[PDB]
Amino acid sequence: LSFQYPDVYRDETAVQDYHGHKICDPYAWLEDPDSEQTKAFVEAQNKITVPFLEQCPIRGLYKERMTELYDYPKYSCHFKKGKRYFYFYNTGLQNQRVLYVQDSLEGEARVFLDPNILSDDGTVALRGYAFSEDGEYFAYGLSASGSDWVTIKFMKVDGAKELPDVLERVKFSCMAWTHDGKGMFYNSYPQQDGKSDGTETSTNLHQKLYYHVLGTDQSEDILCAEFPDEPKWMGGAELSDDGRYVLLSIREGCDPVNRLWYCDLQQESSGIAGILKWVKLIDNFEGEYDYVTNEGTVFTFKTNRHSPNYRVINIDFTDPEESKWKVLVPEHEKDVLEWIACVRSNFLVLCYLHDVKNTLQLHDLTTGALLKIFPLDVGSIVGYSGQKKDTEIFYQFTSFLSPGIIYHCDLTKEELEPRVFREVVKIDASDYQTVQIFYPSKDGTKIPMFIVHKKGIKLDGSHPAFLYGYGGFNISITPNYSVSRLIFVRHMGGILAVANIRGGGEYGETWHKGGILANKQNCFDDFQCAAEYLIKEGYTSPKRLTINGGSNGGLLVAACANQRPDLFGCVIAQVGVMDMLKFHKYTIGHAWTTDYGCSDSKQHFEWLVKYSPLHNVKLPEADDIQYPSMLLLTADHDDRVVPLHSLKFIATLQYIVGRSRKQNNPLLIHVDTKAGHGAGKPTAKVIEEVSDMFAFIARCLNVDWIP
Ligand SMILES: O=C([C@@H]1C=Cc2c(Cl)nc(OCc3ccc(F)cc3)c(=O)n21)N1CCCC1
Numbered sequence: 001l002s003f004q005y006p007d008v009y010r011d012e013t014a015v016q017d018y019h020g021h022k023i024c025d026p027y028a029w030l031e032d033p034d035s036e037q038t039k040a041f042v043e044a045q046n047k048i049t050v051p052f053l054e055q056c057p058i059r060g061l062y063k064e065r066m067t068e069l070y071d072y073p074k075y076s077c078h079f080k081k082g083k084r085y086f087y088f089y090n091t092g093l094q095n096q097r098v099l100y101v102q103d104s105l106e107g108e109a110r111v112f113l114d115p116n117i118l119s120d121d122g123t124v125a126l127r128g129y130a131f132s133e134d135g136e137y138f139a140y141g142l143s144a145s146g147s148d149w150v151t152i153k154f155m156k157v158d159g160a161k162e163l164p165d166v167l168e169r170v171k172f173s174c175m176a177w178t179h180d181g182k183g184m185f186y187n188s189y190p191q192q193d194g195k196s197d198g199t200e201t202s203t204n205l206h207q208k209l210y211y212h213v214l215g216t217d218q219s220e221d222i223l224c225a226e227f228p229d230e231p232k233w234m235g236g237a238e239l240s241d242d243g244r245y246v247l248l249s250i251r252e253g254c255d256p257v258n259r260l261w262y263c264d265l266q267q268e269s270s271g272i273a274g275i276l277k278w279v280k281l282i283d284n285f286e287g288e289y290d291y292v293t294n295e296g297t298v299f300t301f302k303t304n305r306h307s308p309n310y311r312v313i314n315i316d317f318t319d320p321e322e323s324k325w326k327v328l329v330p331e332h333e334k335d336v337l338e339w340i341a342c343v344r345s346n347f348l349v350l351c352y353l354h355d356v357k358n359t360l361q362l363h364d365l366t367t368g369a370l371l372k373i374f375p376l377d378v379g380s381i382v383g384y385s386g387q388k389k390d391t392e393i394f395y396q397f398t399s400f401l402s403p404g405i406i407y408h409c410d411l412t413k414e415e416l417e418p419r420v421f422r423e424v425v426k427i428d429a430s431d432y433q434t435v436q437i438f439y440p441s442k443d444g445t446k447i448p449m450f451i452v453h454k455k456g457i458k459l460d461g462s463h464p465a466f467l468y469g470y471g472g473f474n475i476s477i478t479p480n481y482s483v484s485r486l487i488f489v490r491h492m493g494g495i496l497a498v499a500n501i502r503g504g505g506e507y508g509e510t511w512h513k514g515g516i517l518a519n520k521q522n523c524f525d526d527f528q529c530a531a532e533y534l535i536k537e538g539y540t541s542p543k544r545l546t547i548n549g550g551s552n553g554g555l556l557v558a559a560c561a562n563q564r565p566d567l568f569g570c571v572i573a574q575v576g577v578m579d580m581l582k583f584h585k586y587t588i589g590h591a592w593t594t595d596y597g598c599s600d601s602k603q604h605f606e607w608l609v610k611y612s613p614l615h616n617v618k619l620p621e622a623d624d625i626q627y628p629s630m631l632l633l634t635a636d637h638d639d640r641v642v643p644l645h646s647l648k649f650i651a652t653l654q655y656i657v658g659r660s661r662k663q664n665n666p667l668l669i670h671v672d673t674k675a676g677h678g679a680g681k682p683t684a685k686v687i688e689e690v691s692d693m694f695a696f697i698a699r700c701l702n703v704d705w706i707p
C-alpha cells in the first residue's frame with residue numbers, strides 16, 4: 001500500500017461479561033472522544049485517508065462535474081400561513097436553502113430567513129419550525145455542526161422581526177402553538193454534566209413537554225407532561241385543527257406505536273398552568289395513531305392497529321371503546337398508506353406506496369370514498385402542503401432520472417386540475433433505462449430491486465456497480481433524483497441498484513418485522529442475494545461491485561463485508577452502527593432496541609453477537625479471498641450514531657485484516673469536522689463527500705473517467 005496504518009494501542013485487559021459470554025474490547029478507549037489518545041487516532045487516520053483519495057485523478061474530475069450538474073434551482077412546495085405564502089429555494093449551490101415570503105402567489109417574494117448568514121461555512125441549519133395559527137409569528141430550530149441539539153428562536157412575521165425568546169436544551173422536539181397565539185409546546189432534556197454540543201456521547205433520558213409563553217424567559221416555562229418512572233418515554237404535542245385539544249403522542253422507542261392522550265383545553269381550570277388534565281384515550285404501545293383531523297369529538301387517525309399496511313379510523317371521544325371505532329378507509333391488501341392529510345375542510349389527500357412507488361389521491365372526509373387520482377410518473381412524493389383551512393394543495397415529485405417538480409391543484413374547482421407549478425438539469429433521461437425486478441432471497445421471499453443504467457449495455461459482467469440498501473426502521477427506499485449517482489453512470493460507466501430489503505416499510509409492518517430482532521439476519525441475506533443477482537444476471541462481477549449504506553445501512557454493508565467478503569470489491573459505510581453490543585449506551589441509541597434488541601438481554605445478545613460488525617471481523621479462510629476495500633465516513637458531531645462506532649471498527653479491521661499479508665485492499669476512515677449524522681449538511685460538504693466516495697471507488701477498482 002502507498003501508506004502505513006497508524007499505531008493503535010490494544011487494551012488486552014478490557015473484557016465485558018454478557019450473561020457468561022466474555023467479549024474483549026481492546027479499543028474501548030476510543031469511546032472517549034475527548035482524550036488525547038482518541039484525538040491522536042483520528043488525526044493519524046485522516047492523514048492516511050486524505051492523500052489516498054486526493055491522489056486519485058478522478059476526484060477532481062468528479063468534483064468539477066458534480067459542482068456543474070448539482071447547480072440547478074431547487075424549490076420546495078409553497079405553503080400558506082395566514083395571509084402569506086412561503087417557500088424554500090436554493091439558487092443552486094447555496095450551502096443552505098433560504099425561506100422566502102410573499103403576499104400572494106403573483107406577489108414579489110422576499111427573503112424571510114436565510115440560514116447562510118448564521119455561519120461562514122453553512123454549518124448552521126434549520127431543524128424544525130412552526131408558524132402560529134394566524135401565521136403572524138414563527139418559531140424555528142437551529143442546529144450547529146450537524147448536531148441533533150436545537151436552539152429554538154422566534155420571529156414576528158410582519159417585518160421579519162427577531163424576538164428575544166430563546167429555548168435551549170431542545171432535542172427530538174415537537175413545536176406546536178396553541179391557537180390563542182399565547183405560546184408554544186416543545187420538548188427539552190434536563191441539564192447534564194459535560195458537553196451538549198454533539199461531541200458528547202451521553203444518553204438522552206427524561207425528555208419533558210414544556211409550554212413557552214411568548215415574551216417570557218424559558219425559566220418560566222410550564223411543565224405539562226413528564227414521565228419520571230419511564231425515562232425513555234417521549235411525549236410530543238400537537239393541537240387539533242379547531243384548537244380545542246392537545247393531542248399527546250407518547251413514544252418509547254423507534255417502534256411505529258404510540259400512546260395517545262388528549263387534553264381538552266376548555267377543561268383546564270386556569271389555562272396552561274402545570275401538568276394538564278390528560279385523558280388517557282389509548283394508554284398502551286400496541287399501535288400507531290397519527291392525527292389527521294377532527295369534527296367535534298370525532299377524531300380521524302391513521303393507524304396500523306390490526307392493519308400492517310395502515311388504514312384510517314374514526315374514534316369518537318364520547319364513545320371511545322375499540323369495538324365502536326369506524327373504519328373510514330380500510331387497509332389495502334398490498335398498498336401501504338404512507339400518509340394522509342385533511343385539506344379544504346372535507347377532503348383527504350392519501351399517499352400510498354405501490355411496489356415501492358408513490359401514488360396520490362383525493363378522498364371524501366365523510367365517507368372515505370375515492371374522488372380523484374392525481375396522475376404521477378414512477379417515483380416518490382417528497383413534499384406536500386395543504387391544511388384543513390387551505391383550499392389548494394402543492395406536492396413535490398421526484399424520480400431517478402428527472403429532478404423534483406412541483407404540482408399545484410386548486411381544490412375549490414368543479415373540475416380538479418393538477419398542474420405543473422415549478423419545473424426545472426442541462427442530462428438526457430432518454431439515454432438511461434430504469435427497471436424494477438424481484439429476486440428471491442435465501443428463504444424464498446421475493447425482494448424488489450431498482451436498477452438504472454445506460455441503455456443498450458451488454459450484460460457481460462464488465463460494468464462497475466453501486467448497490468445501495470438500508471433495511472430497517474420502517475423506512476422505505478423509494479426513487480429520488482441523485483446527480484451524484486448519475487455521474488457514476490455517465491462518467492464512470494456504472495450501474496446503479498437499490499435493493500428494498502426487509503426491515504424497511506415497503507410492504508408495511510410485516511416487511512419491517514421481517515428484518516428486526518431475531519430476524520435481523522434476513523436484511524443481510526436479502527442484500528447479499530441482491531449482489532448475487534446482479535452478478536448472476538451479468539450486470540457486474542464481485543471485484544467491480546461497490547456496496548453502500550448509511551446509518552442502519554452502514555451496519556448493513558459492514559455486516560455483509562464480514563459475512564461475504566468475496567462478493568464485493570468496495571464497501572462504503574457512512575455513519576454506521578458497528579458496535580451492536582454497546583449502541584444502546586449512547587445518546588438516543590436506547591431507542592433502536594425496538595429494531596435490534598439490547599445486549600442486556602441474554603436472548604438478544606445471542607442474536608446481536610452473530611452479526612455485530614465490530615465482533616465479526618475475521619480473516620477469510622480461503623487464500624484467494626481478502627476483504628474488500630472499505631471506507632468508513634463519519635463526523636465529529638454525529639450525535640445520532642456516535643463516531644466511536646466507526647473508530648472502533650476501523651481499528652479492528654486494520655489490526656485483524658490489514659496486517660495480513662494477503663490483504664492489499666485499503667481499509668480507511670475519514671472523520672469530518674463541523675458535521676454530524678447528515679441532516680442539514682451544507683452543499684459544499686455534500687459535494688466533498690460524494691467526491692470522496694467516487695474517488696475511493698475509482699482508485700480501488702481502477703475505473704477510468706469517461707469524458
Ligand atoms: O436515527 C436513527 C433512527 C431511525 C430514524 C430515526 C428518527 Cl426519525 N429519530 C430518531 O431519534 C429520535 C427519536 C424520536 C422519537 C422517538 F420516539 C424515538 C427517537 C432515531 O433514532 N431514528 N437510527 C437508527 C439506526 C441508527 C440511527
